[PDB]
Structure formats: structure tokens, C-alpha cells
Design a protein around this ligand. Structure first.
Ligand SMILES: CCCCS(=O)(=O)Nc1ccc2[nH]ncc2c1
Ligand SMILES: CCCCS(=O)(=O)Nc1ccc2[nH]ncc2c1
Ligand code: NA
Ligand code: NA
Lengths: 413, 413
């Protein structure tokens, strides 16, 4: 059973929303990427000077989430819940505020951590003034399912509200499980994607101490160099992203105009190391292969790979091997983290949206900062200018610390 | 397509492990439950008197996890990772240490929160000594996918390592997704269940400020009273639980004797309330109904319901409505939280293991403290002494903060 042979129902993407370091408007982010814009800047936050952080670069959201939040929302929600509410509302408006069957409507939203700032706040409040100073709302704000739960309540989804956690692949895994919920017949429509917290001193310290992060502070826009010989780790770029998926029949019935098809999803694991990806890229490649099996595609059908491409030395080398294992090494490769940086639990969802726009508009943006090819990579990296083409099929790659591999197969509508 | 009509492959439970407030040995926990034992005691921890907490009762594990942890494991893992590794090794030994195909072997382990104590440790270390006092190991211990990742790495699972988070339903949802991973053909064998952190001062503060917890401190063993007129909220009872599931053909090939059949799983959502179940129990009932649809069973086939039964006023009232909506109100009901208390992200997995043992041994333990049945609830709650009966099919119910409903349909082997 496959999408191609009608074993699974046809599933279409009918709306997308994202907030990024370039714009709060996904169409403006898209136009900016195609024009070679970067969201990465010098961090002006006082915490950089306070701690003299080795990393002094990153992409804050162009439009901060809390500029849209009233006093009640600031008191009763964690940051990722506030981001979830904002994007959920925007997505539903973009979809024409459809009246769907709540009992056939699912939400699947991944995140890296959850309402972690409310853990440290509760800890500090209790140490200061005892247990009665902890908010009655602490549990519902902290719990990592909090963002999915807020969006489910907001939009009226009664066919399941789910939160997969797999670190940097959480946002893609959410879209994978939303696809599974529809093709298994539990839902006809799903809001899915990923949200993530902002750049702060403790997050920078934790990832910096792994030596995972770029310290090219003198030239912030040149720091994120996926697949480049001179890469030195990832750059934080804040983001959140949701898409609306539904059966082709459901979309047709309400006169929704599909952006793309979601054809298949592959989830595998390395069982190799807690943070290092498997050097051979075999299980990562097999995630890509599994997405093709469920789609009913061959590797020769794949015109485009949206790479995980974090710009770590070991990460990009492993992914180049994975793309070869999957037989997709003739595909045009884009690494959006070159321009938008790394949003951890959100980034797979953001890159899924970018993959949909590539197929909709028949264009791949340039991988920024790709100036010196690495002999170990040997990929067709899109660079210098956007690449226009009749792109029919694309795979979005997303890999997570812990050895989690998620590949999503998309088709042009 | 159903288990009954052969649309899904037959999936069997071949091993179980759990650590509880009664015993570190699941077979000894089971004998203790049948003897009418409670794991709930007066908390003797210094932190109770230090903070003068409103809740002074709970079930610590009979055998603490860290009594089995050497210095290396204490330094490189969060608590839920240490619990995960301990149970992972115990389960594999119980299964006869099988040599399986790593590329057909999945891990799905739920948890409520993750390595949260390492967030507050990292925060304290940075505030005291700056960013270079944060461990290179912090991210991999903190990340909520950490416990599943540790078990995947320990046992060599390369067909996916997944962590669903849905608060009190996480452990059941993990078993649901493991069943999905097998019936969709991604894996032939899966380790699945739930782990959760210990009873500490901040957890008691956060949950007790929700006003959801029993304050019957003078009679700890009498505090947890699911479906009783005098119930006054839930009691913490520490646990972790894993089961090994595989296709019946995979079990037969290696000569594994199944303990039970896992027939189907239903996941729905309320989209009503953030911390309480919907009073009408309709979506919770639909999760039970969905599990029966996928199993290919009718409500009349269900001999036993292992209730969520948290002993909150609203929880037990809503669940009584859910069981009636699902047509299962003639089933024999057990509320194990009466004896073992509430282990949040682990409890759905623990109660799934108890459902398996009920079917294997044809016996339901007594629901403790069921002395004045609630006049507004009419369920067949097993109480007094264990009920020996011809239990062919059972549903395990789990509900989670955020409006999550998970039902698992099990069959006698
Ligand atoms: C793109 C930057 C991401 C940093 S993260 O991975 O640490 N996520 C995160 C989650 C919750 C948070 N609350 N407050 C800060 C914060 C950061
Ligand atoms: C049955 C007791 C559950 C309490 S919890 O839900 O708060 N879980 C939890 C998770 C991580 C933790 N790290 N340190 C303490 C701790 C507790
Ligand atoms: Na990608
Ligand atoms: Na139960």
C-alpha cells in the first residue's frame, strides 16, 4: 500500500504559516530567501555582554510573539504556547476559517523542550517564598504537550492532539504523525508543525559547550555555512511554523486550493551516539527510502532535497552519506539554515513549509555562504542565485540529537 | 481493516517490566495488589517539613532507581534516562536477550516532562560560575526524547525511537504508537511504555497548587479512593513500566510465549479544558470506541476496563460517562491508582502491564478504599477481594492534562 497505488488516501497541504528572523509573513520570508536575504545579525541582548558568551550572533524573530499578547496570555501561557496560539490563529485565517468536523480534526505540534522558562521561574519563586508562590498554572504551562493542547483548544480539534519530541526533528516528526493519523482514517484534516523558545543565555551556553555552534561573530550573515569547507557549527534562528493538511476529497469539498501533496513519511533511528550522527548515514538514508516506499516513488523521481544541513562538521558529512545511501545524490540540495538558522523543535516544520513553497513556485533559494566545496560532501548544492525548475517531487530531511531521522516526501499539486 | 479481519498483523506482548511503590519486580507488585496491598505511605523526606507541604503522602519506589546506578551513570544521565536504562536491561533479560534485526526494532517511550532537574542544575551552575560551568552533556540529559534515546542506544533499535508527550496519557500513547509502527510495517518488534521522575518538593508544590491532589495525610493508604463518595483528588505513586511487543510470527520464530494480544489503540482529544476532562465523557468514550473498531471488537466483547480512575471528583465522573458512551458499562472495572497512586507519564504504561496480567491470570485485583460507592456513578467496580473471571478482552483507559484520551484494546492469548 502506497499513495501512488491508492493504498493511502491523497493528502494535500492547503495552508502554511511561519514566523522567522526575516519576517512574520511566510510569503515575505520566501521572497526574502529568493533575494538572498539572511535573518542572522549581531545579538544586542544584554545577556551576551553579561556572560561574555563565545556566540554573539543569531536571528531573533523579526516580529516578537509577545508584541501580540495581552496580560492574561502573558500570565497563563508559556512562550511556546503563546507562539502556538499566534500561529494557530494566523493559519486558520489563511485557510479561510473553515467549519470542519471537530471529531475528524487532529493537531500534531512538536517542540524541543516545552515551557522550560516556567520551570526555572517556579524553582526561583519557591526558593524565595515557599510552595504557595508556585502558580496553579505552572503544570499546564510547563508540560511539553502545552503548545499542541492550546492550538487544539483554540481551533476545536477532537480527533487527537499529539506532541512528538525528537529534538531537532520534532517539527518534521509532527507532520509525519499528522499524515499517519489521516491515512489510518482517524482524521480528515490536521494542523501540524513545530514551535520553539527564543534565543537566551542558557540555551547558547548548553549548545556552545557541545562545540555545536558557529563563533564567526565578525560577519554574522556569513556564519551559517552548511556543506561549506569552512563551516564551524550552527547559528540559532528563531522560528515557528504550522501547515494545514487534509484529504484531497476534504479540500475539494470546501473549495480549498492545494499548495502541494504530502505523499509519505519515514522515521528511523541511528542507535549510534547520544549527540553524534552515524558517520555512514545508512539509517538516515533509510528514513528517506521509507518516505519513498510509502509515497510509491523511486529515488530517480526526487528532483530536490531540503537538507537538515546544520553546518556542523560531523552533521553535514553524515547527511551527504545519507543522501548517497538513499540514491538521491543527483537531487538539487538546499540548506535553509544558511539563511534562517536553527530553530531546534520548530525547524523541521519551517523547512517542510519551504519544501511546499519550492514545489508550488518551481524555485529553490540559494544556500547562503556556499563558497568552498568540501570533497567529503560531493552534492549538487543550490548556491549563488535561486534555481528555477519543473520540480515534481522533493524530500525534506530533519535529524535530531539522540539519533532521530525523519524524511517527508512532498509532490507538486 | 482490523486485527479481527486480518487487515492488521497480529501483535503480541512477550515481556513486561515495572518498578513501583510496592516492588521492583512486576510479578511481586501483582501478588501485592491481589493481596490488597497499598504502596502509599507518609512521606519521610526532609523537604516535607522544610516546606510544610499541603501533601505529606505518596508512594516512593520500593527499590530506588539510583541504588542500581554507578558513578558514570549518575553523571551522564537524567533521572528518567537512568530509570529507562534500568528497565530496558531488565525487560531484555526477561525476553531471553533476543537477537533481533535492529532495522526492524523500534522504541516508543513516553514521559511527562524529561530531564528537568538538569535544567535547574545547569541554571544554578551558570548563575554561580558562568556559561562554561554548563556540562557538554546538559542538552542530551535535558531533552525529553532522552530516555527513549538511551533505551534505543542500549538495545540497538534502528526502526525509530519516539517519545509522545501527553502528560498522564504519555505511557499509553507510547504503546499506541508502537502498535501503529508495527501494523504500518515499519517494525516487527518494539520496546514501549513510560518513565517518570520522583516525588520531590517542587513537583508536589506545582501539582498541589492545581488543587487536584488528596490531602488525607493522617491515613495515607486510605487517601486514593477512585469512584468513592469521599474521594478528594489523586496521590503520587512513583513508577516506570516497559513491555516488549512484536508480530505473532516474530514471537513464534524465536519461541517467545505471548502474555497477551495488543489488538487496537484509540487517540482522541476533548478540545474543552486544559487540566480537567470534559464532563460529558464523549471524546474519551470515542477513544475506547476507536480502539474497538481497529481491534474488530464490539462493546459487548469487553469484559474488563482498567480505568484511568485518578480519584478526582470530575475525573471519575467524566470517565463513568465515557465508559457508558462507549457501551462498556457492563465491564468489570479496576482503578489501580487506588493502590499504586499516579505516576503521570509512566502510569498508562504501568496500567497496560496490569491489563496484560489480568488477561493472563484471569483475575482483577480489588480497587482499594471503595467503601461508599458514589451514588451518581453506577460502574461494576471490583472491590473487597480479587475477582477470578473469564476475561477475554479488556480496554486500558488513560487521560492526560491538555484533553488527551488514549484507549488500548488487549486480548487474552
Ligand atoms: C532558537 C532558539 C532555541 C533555544 S532552545 O532550544 O533552548 N529552546 C527554548 C525553549 C524554551 C525556552 N524558554 N525560554 C527560553 C527557551 C528556549
Ligand atoms: C510520581 C511523581 C511525579 C512527579 S513529576 O510529574 O513532576 N515528574 C518529574 C519529572 C522530572 C523530575 N526531575 N526531578 C524531579 C522530577 C519529577
Ligand atoms: Na530540511
Ligand atoms: Na487505566
Amino acid at each position: 500500500p502506497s499513495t501512488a497505488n491508492g493504498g493511502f488516501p491523497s493528502v494535500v497541504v492547503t495552508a502554511v504559516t511561519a514566523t522567522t528572523s526575516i519576517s512574520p509573513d511566510i510569503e515575505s520570508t520566501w521572497k526574502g530567501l529568493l533575494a538572498g536575504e539572511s535573518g542572522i545579525h549581531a545579538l544586542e541582548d544584554e545577556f551576551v555582554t553579561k556572560w561574555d558568551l563565545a556566540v554573539k550572533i543569531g536571528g531573533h524573530l523579526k516580529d516578537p510573539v509577545d508584541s501580540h499578547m495581552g496580560r492574561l496570555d502573558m500570565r497563563r501561557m508559556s512562550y511556546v504556547q503563546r507562539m502556538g496560539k499566534l500561529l494557530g490563529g494566523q493559519l486558520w485565517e489563511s485557510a479561510g476559517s473553515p467549519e470542519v468536523d471537530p471529531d475528524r480534526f487532529a493537531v500534531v505540534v512538536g517542540t524541543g523542550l516545552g515551557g522550560a522558562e516556567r520551570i526555572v521561574e517556579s524553582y526561583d519563586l519557591m526558593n524565595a517564598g515557599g510552595p504557595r508562590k508556585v502558580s496553579p498554572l505552572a503544570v499546564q504551562m510547563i508540560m511539553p504537550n502545552g503548545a499542541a493542547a492550546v492550538i487544539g483548544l483554540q481551533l476545536g480539534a477532537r480527533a487527537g492532539v499529539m506532541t512528538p519530541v525528537s529534538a531537532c526533528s520534532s517539527g518534521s516528526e509532527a507532520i509525519a504523525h499528522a499524515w499517519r493519523q489521516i491515512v489510518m482514517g482517524d482524521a480528515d484534516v490536521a494542523v501540524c508543525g513545530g514551535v520553539e523558545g527564543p534565543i537566551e543565555a542558557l540555551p547558547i551556553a548548553a549548545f556552545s559547550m557541545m562545540r555545536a555552534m558557529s563563533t564567526r561573530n565578525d560577519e554574522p550573515e556569513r556564519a551559517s555555512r552548511p556543506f561549506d569547507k569552512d563551516r564551524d557549527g550552527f547559528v540559532f534562528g528563531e522560528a515557528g511554523a504550522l501547515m494545514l493538511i487534509e484529504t484531497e476529497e476534504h479540500a475539494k469539498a470546501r473549495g480549498a486550493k492545494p499548495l502541494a501533496r504530502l505523499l509519505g513519511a519515514g522515521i528511523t533511528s541511528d542507535a549510534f551516539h547520544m549527540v553524534a550522527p552515524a558517520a555512514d548515514g545508512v539509517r538516515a538514508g533509510r528514513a528517506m527510502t521509507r518516505s519513498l516506499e510509502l509515497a510509491g516513488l523511486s529515488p530517480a523521481d526526487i528532483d530536490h532535497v531540503n537538507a537538515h544541513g546544520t553546518a556542523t562538521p560531523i552533521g553535514d558529512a553524515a547527511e551527504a552519506n545519507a543522501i548517497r545511501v538513499a540514491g538521491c545524490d543527483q537531487a538539487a540540495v538546499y540548506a535553509p539554515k544558511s539563511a534562517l538558522g536553527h530553530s531546534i523543535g520548530a525547524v523541521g516544520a519551517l523547512e517542510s513549509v519551504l519544501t511546499v513553497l519550492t514545489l508550488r513556485d518551481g524555485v529553490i533559494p540559494p544556500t547562503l555562504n556556499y563558497e568552498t566545496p568540501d570533497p567529503e560532501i560531493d552534492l549538487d548544492v543550490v548556491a549563488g542565485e535561486p534555481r528555477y525548475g519543473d520540480y515534481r517531487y522533493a524530500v525534506n530531511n530533519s535529524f535530531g540529537f539522540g539519533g532521530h531521522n525523519v524524511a517527508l516526501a512532498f509532490g507538486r499539486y
